[PDB]
Amino acid sequence: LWHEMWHEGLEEASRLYFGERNVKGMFEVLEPLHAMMERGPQTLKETSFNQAYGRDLMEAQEWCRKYMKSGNVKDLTQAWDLYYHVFRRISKQ
Amino acid sequence: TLHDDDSCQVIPVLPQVMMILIPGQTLPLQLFHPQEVSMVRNLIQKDRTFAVLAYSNVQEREAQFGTTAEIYAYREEQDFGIEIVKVKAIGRQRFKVLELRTQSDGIQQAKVQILPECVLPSTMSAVQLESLNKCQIFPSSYKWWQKYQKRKFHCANLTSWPRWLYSLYDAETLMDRIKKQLREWDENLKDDSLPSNPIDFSYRVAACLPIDDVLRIQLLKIGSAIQRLRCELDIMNKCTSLCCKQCQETEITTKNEIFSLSLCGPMAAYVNPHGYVHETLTVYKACNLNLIGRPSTEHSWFPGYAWTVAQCKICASHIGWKFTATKKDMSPQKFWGLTRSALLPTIPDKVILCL
Amino acid sequence: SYNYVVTAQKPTAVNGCVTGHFTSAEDLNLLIAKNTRLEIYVVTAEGLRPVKEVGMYGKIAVMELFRPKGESKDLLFILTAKYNACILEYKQSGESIDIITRAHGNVQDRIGRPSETGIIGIIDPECRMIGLRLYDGLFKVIPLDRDNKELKAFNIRLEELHVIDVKFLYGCQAPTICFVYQDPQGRHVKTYEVSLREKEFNKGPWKQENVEAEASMVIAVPEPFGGAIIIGQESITYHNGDKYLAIAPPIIKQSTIVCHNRVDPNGSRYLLGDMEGRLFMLLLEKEEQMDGTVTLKDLRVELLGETSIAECLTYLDNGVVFVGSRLGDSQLVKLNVDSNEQGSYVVAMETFTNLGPIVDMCVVDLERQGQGQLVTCSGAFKEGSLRIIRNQKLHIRTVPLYESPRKICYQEVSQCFGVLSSRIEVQDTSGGTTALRPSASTQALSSSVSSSKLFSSSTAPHETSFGEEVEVHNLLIIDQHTFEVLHAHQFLQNEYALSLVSCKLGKDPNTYFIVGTAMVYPEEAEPKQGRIVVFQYSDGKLQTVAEKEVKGAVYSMVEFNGKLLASINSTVRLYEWTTEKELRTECNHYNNIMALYLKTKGDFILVGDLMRSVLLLAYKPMEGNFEEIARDFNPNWMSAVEILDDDNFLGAENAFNLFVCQKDSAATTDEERQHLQEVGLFHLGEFVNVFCHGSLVMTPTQGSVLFGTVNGMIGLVTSLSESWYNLLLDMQNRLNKVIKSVGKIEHSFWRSFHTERKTEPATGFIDGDLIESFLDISRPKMQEVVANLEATADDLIKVVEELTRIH
Ligand SMILES: COc1cscc1-c1cn([C@H]2CCC(=O)NC2=O)nn1
Ligand SMILES: [Zn+2]
């Protein structure tokens, strides 16, 4: 839950956007995971995950929202830079 | 529904609207919550009028102004059991906000004072000689306007000012001058498409000028349609350089580059796939714009053209898109499309705006 | 702020005149309307004998005489601009004379926009009803019957929305109207019957007919002819039930006929006047039948001569015609059977003074006694002149110019006035322009012209059309003692002179005449070029000293602490006069309104536009720029403005009103320190063109501001204390309970601020004419007014006689 969840949701979201070239599928995987963060942590590992990754995860969503208005692919690349920074730190452990 | 002016009237407020609406601007709504269905249906059987709120400071919910919007269409889709109210409304009168109360159901009722629409008479009505009253009805173009001015403003000889000065405060002359300026930007402009009333004409023009939100607010603060027409005409003559809003000084395009590709004018409202609306101004040439990514024909607002994101060369702020033709026989092979919200009307080389 | 407004010279412009038998059945009367005044005379062949003159609380719009069946004399009907209707009767109790209100009542509607052609008031020939046309789409009817004291009326729906003129026909069994209206098909004449019982329009005696697309007036011809005459730009046509006759007289094509009067009671002869002073006579030639009936044989029009620009006309006994004139002096002319050695059948007998319209003016001490005299720019076109008013009470001298004066300023060091004037010229086949008549600008002792190759306009091809009127502007120098035109300087082609000032600048000893102009071209809506020309009067001629080119119209200029402050379009620019006799820009302040009006007191400047946008500025020496102290944007047509003091500003706004704006007292606030509260409102009933500081006399009242109006009325505004305003405000409510108003119009309803869609009671103003009327009443009535509020009749005699001394 949360660590392995966000980790497995970024692998699937990358396979949908980069591999299948489907923006809609990527947002479908990402949206529930972001909604979970909005609800808030209810476990120690959940709380520990919001302290180190939470801020980086909410900025990539803002960058996704900027793309949805502008239509600028570079805004999705800015979100994907933040998603990969968190993915690597999650993989470290 | 046109309520009395200078009187404090309570009007229901729509909770999901935080954008400045100009009197007579198309605002298609698509509500879904039952808290916004049992009130939209209550107004349909009473007065048919809700209040759109304007926030000077959107970040701190500071609302001190707004404009009413009469409901002129109703349609209710019974899709998947969930009631969806699909209503279209048009802006009627400007109002000022004084006190907004909060109810126990989920609606805010505010006591708003409608600011009067100051309809002045003709400048010659208080100085026209009684003998010449019968010469005011003109029987039923460059030389026609000379004779119109010479006959209507003949009695200006009784005052301290000439006839040409009174033409600068005449509604018919101002509207005709604006129409000529609009024709330069749109060769496909139809006269029947523009209202003949100076109140409606002024508000229609305010929603067509490529200007920032601050200027749109300034035009709505004006009470008389004559002053609003004059300010609109002054913007068209002085604010010739369009700059990036974030930079404030980086020029992007000029007034002489504005043209109308389609029959909706030079700055029509288009909706993106995600639902965001972009009042896009079309120009032939631009400066200080870098292209991001590759051309795409997906969801292209102009058929036969591909779009490529355009950004500020200095601050990297999104300005709009470049449109490249797919067929080599399309006359406007390449043109630009700029979102109004990204631009700042500027007076080049400091003069300001006149009312 | 509290002010006292009093009339110095009553309105002189004549807006209406009628003849009849109002005082008695055996006397021929001449009634003359002068805006708020009504004059009554008796025609006796030796001129006009003044009998009675009254003032009404309203702007006289309609004035007609009529004699109901039971009446022995004629009754007078008057409708005002504020829609106050009244039937009046002349009553003489041996020595005392009084105008009696037989009936009265306001006839305005709650809804309806004022008609395009204005108020039209007509009375049925057999006195069955009074027809009024006030709003487009309606025709108000006041039924004429004995017990209708409240002038109760009813409206009839009228389908034709654009009615130009309407009249009641003669010799009709039922009341019948005849009018001309315009629809997308053109102009047409139509008739309608009026049934009081039905309250509706029945079918008329003759069907609708087409007229000249420029048909403007209708004349109902009395019996034996009956029917109506339609007059247009190029045709005069007659119409009745079974006949029509049309003529196209080329002698009328030069100007539009705008006024008429019937000479013979049977309608055989009719005088007609145009916009340029030509007087004509229309003859209805008659072909009589064996049974006494008359048919219209033919129509003939003959030019008689030249009169002052006629607003209204009235034939009096034996060749004598009264000529009412809004733009020039009214006259009494004689229509001689034989023409003089010049060719005119018209000869002037008497001339009555008309200051109106007063476009500009100034106060000057000439005999050097201490008493100021007013010199105004009066009239227009051939009637244009200067009028010197001195302190029967007011002595007026006329200096005819035969062209339109516009601005005026006095130069003390040169003993001469500077006057901007304009004359109309017309293009000729030769290729240039020719003047219509000699005038001041063409009869000066010496003349000069402007030169400017540097001021060549780009978009102006100068391909002026043929037979087009062209306005030529000039600066005239007029001697203060002889009033002869010493010099005339013509400005550049297409150059419109706007502002004028005489002053010294910087360290230069020489006083200069400075003019602010604008380059006006038909193609350009707003002027993009202008000039500030400096002139020096030396050796009876005007020599240009400095010429500054600007990018806009120089609407106004003023001397500001040794510097020249000018208004170019929206900018208020200050200039310095360098030791090389040149203008140099010192600073610019860009405004958000058109700087038409520009006044200055001390270090602050008042800026205004045509839509009553008032903004105050202050020149900050440290900044070297102007700063906005306060502003009020109440949209309404403003004709004039003036600074009363540091925190009070008097103006004139639409619907003949005066207003005063006051600067807030800075009560621990900032948004109200920049807000100007309206403390004064008053309905003057006159259109003010110019305010002027000064006085015509040799201190309970503080300050003195004179003003000139379109109707030639001169007024005076002075400040009052807090205690003085409440006593005079109390005396007005007291005098209104006793003074009998003609038509029974309440003084509060007459002076209340009024516009087309707004009405408020008057505040911060004292009607000085009402206060001065207190002295002109009987001693027992004087005491009735001052009953309680201590203050005896005797004590309030020197109070009013003290206020009398101001003017
Ligand atoms: C498929 O595009 C997107 C994915 S996420 C946001 C967009 C988008 C597209 N546009 C504009 C681009 C110009 C145009 O002609 N039509 C549009 O709709 N604006 N935003
Ligand atoms: Zn930028």
mmCIF file of N, CA and C and ligand atoms in Angstrom, chain A residues 23 67-72, chain B residues 270-274 278 296 298-302 305 307 318 321 323, ligand 1:
data_model
loop_
_atom_site.group_PDB
_atom_site.id
_atom_site.type_symbol
_atom_site.label_atom_id
_atom_site.label_comp_id
_atom_site.label_asym_id
_atom_site.label_seq_id
_atom_site.Cartn_x
_atom_site.Cartn_y
_atom_site.Cartn_z
ATOM 1 N N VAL A 23 -2.790 9.120 -23.370
ATOM 2 C CA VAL A 23 -2.811 10.072 -22.256
ATOM 3 C C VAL A 23 -3.953 9.724 -21.299
ATOM 4 N N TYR A 67 -0.957 21.164 -18.521
ATOM 5 C CA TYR A 67 -1.004 20.545 -19.846
ATOM 6 C C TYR A 67 -2.446 20.456 -20.327
ATOM 7 N N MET A 68 -3.379 20.083 -19.451
ATOM 8 C CA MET A 68 -4.774 19.911 -19.853
ATOM 9 C C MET A 68 -5.375 21.201 -20.409
ATOM 10 N N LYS A 69 -4.904 22.369 -19.961
ATOM 11 C CA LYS A 69 -5.371 23.667 -20.464
ATOM 12 C C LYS A 69 -4.579 24.124 -21.696
ATOM 13 N N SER A 70 -3.253 24.197 -21.576
ATOM 14 C CA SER A 70 -2.391 24.665 -22.658
ATOM 15 C C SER A 70 -2.298 23.693 -23.839
ATOM 16 N N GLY A 71 -2.179 22.416 -23.534
ATOM 17 C CA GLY A 71 -1.932 21.366 -24.511
ATOM 18 C C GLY A 71 -0.445 21.202 -24.784
ATOM 19 N N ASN A 72 0.403 21.675 -23.847
ATOM 20 C CA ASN A 72 1.845 21.665 -23.961
ATOM 21 C C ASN A 72 2.430 20.371 -23.426
ATOM 22 N N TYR B 270 -13.175 29.178 -28.442
ATOM 23 C CA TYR B 270 -13.090 27.769 -28.808
ATOM 24 C C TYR B 270 -12.886 26.951 -27.546
ATOM 25 N N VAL B 271 -13.304 25.683 -27.555
ATOM 26 C CA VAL B 271 -13.176 24.836 -26.371
ATOM 27 C C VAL B 271 -12.210 23.703 -26.660
ATOM 28 N N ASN B 272 -11.263 23.471 -25.745
ATOM 29 C CA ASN B 272 -10.266 22.407 -25.902
ATOM 30 C C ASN B 272 -10.882 21.019 -25.525
ATOM 31 N N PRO B 273 -10.188 19.869 -25.728
ATOM 32 C CA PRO B 273 -10.804 18.576 -25.347
ATOM 33 C C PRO B 273 -11.121 18.451 -23.863
ATOM 34 N N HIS B 274 -10.256 18.996 -23.021
ATOM 35 C CA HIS B 274 -10.454 18.994 -21.574
ATOM 36 C C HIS B 274 -11.557 19.964 -21.092
ATOM 37 N N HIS B 278 -10.783 28.991 -24.770
ATOM 38 C CA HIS B 278 -9.719 29.887 -25.199
ATOM 39 C C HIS B 278 -10.194 30.890 -26.246
ATOM 40 N N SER B 296 0.276 19.031 -34.567
ATOM 41 C CA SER B 296 -0.739 18.007 -34.352
ATOM 42 C C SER B 296 -2.064 18.483 -34.921
ATOM 43 N N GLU B 298 -4.900 16.912 -34.015
ATOM 44 C CA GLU B 298 -5.893 16.461 -33.051
ATOM 45 C C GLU B 298 -6.634 17.634 -32.442
ATOM 46 N N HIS B 299 -7.971 17.627 -32.564
ATOM 47 C CA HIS B 299 -8.848 18.651 -32.005
ATOM 48 C C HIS B 299 -8.586 20.046 -32.574
ATOM 49 N N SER B 300 -8.058 20.137 -33.806
ATOM 50 C CA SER B 300 -7.759 21.427 -34.415
ATOM 51 C C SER B 300 -9.020 22.255 -34.598
ATOM 52 N N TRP B 301 -9.022 23.460 -34.035
ATOM 53 C CA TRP B 301 -10.147 24.379 -34.135
ATOM 54 C C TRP B 301 -10.356 24.886 -35.565
ATOM 55 N N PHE B 302 -9.292 24.907 -36.384
ATOM 56 C CA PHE B 302 -9.365 25.332 -37.772
ATOM 57 C C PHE B 302 -9.153 24.117 -38.680
ATOM 58 N N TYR B 305 -5.691 22.630 -40.714
ATOM 59 C CA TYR B 305 -4.506 23.188 -40.068
ATOM 60 C C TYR B 305 -4.058 22.344 -38.894
ATOM 61 N N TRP B 307 -1.742 22.397 -35.220
ATOM 62 C CA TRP B 307 -1.299 23.336 -34.188
ATOM 63 C C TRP B 307 0.028 22.899 -33.555
ATOM 64 N N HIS B 318 2.969 30.218 -21.631
ATOM 65 C CA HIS B 318 2.143 29.813 -22.762
ATOM 66 C C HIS B 318 1.380 31.014 -23.312
ATOM 67 N N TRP B 321 -0.663 29.124 -29.970
ATOM 68 C CA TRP B 321 -0.204 28.096 -30.891
ATOM 69 C C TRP B 321 0.060 28.654 -32.282
ATOM 70 N N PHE B 323 -0.242 27.779 -36.339
ATOM 71 C CA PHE B 323 -1.070 26.946 -37.193
ATOM 72 C C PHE B 323 -0.438 26.806 -38.566
HETATM 73 C C1 LIG D 1 -5.338 17.377 -27.888
HETATM 74 O O1 LIG D 1 -4.911 18.634 -27.309
HETATM 75 C C2 LIG D 1 -4.803 18.716 -25.957
HETATM 76 C C3 LIG D 1 -4.478 17.746 -25.069
HETATM 77 S S1 LIG D 1 -4.453 18.357 -23.478
HETATM 78 C C4 LIG D 1 -4.879 19.924 -23.987
HETATM 79 C C5 LIG D 1 -5.030 19.999 -25.343
HETATM 80 C C6 LIG D 1 -5.283 21.276 -26.019
HETATM 81 C C7 LIG D 1 -5.465 21.468 -27.363
HETATM 82 N N1 LIG D 1 -5.647 22.797 -27.490
HETATM 83 C C8 LIG D 1 -5.960 23.557 -28.698
HETATM 84 C C9 LIG D 1 -4.743 23.651 -29.624
HETATM 85 C C10 LIG D 1 -5.123 24.493 -30.841
HETATM 86 C C11 LIG D 1 -6.366 24.017 -31.538
HETATM 87 O O2 LIG D 1 -6.611 24.277 -32.710
HETATM 88 N N2 LIG D 1 -7.263 23.294 -30.785
HETATM 89 C C12 LIG D 1 -7.156 22.991 -29.442
HETATM 90 O O3 LIG D 1 -8.005 22.306 -28.875
HETATM 91 N N3 LIG D 1 -5.568 23.414 -26.292
HETATM 92 N N4 LIG D 1 -5.352 22.484 -25.392
#
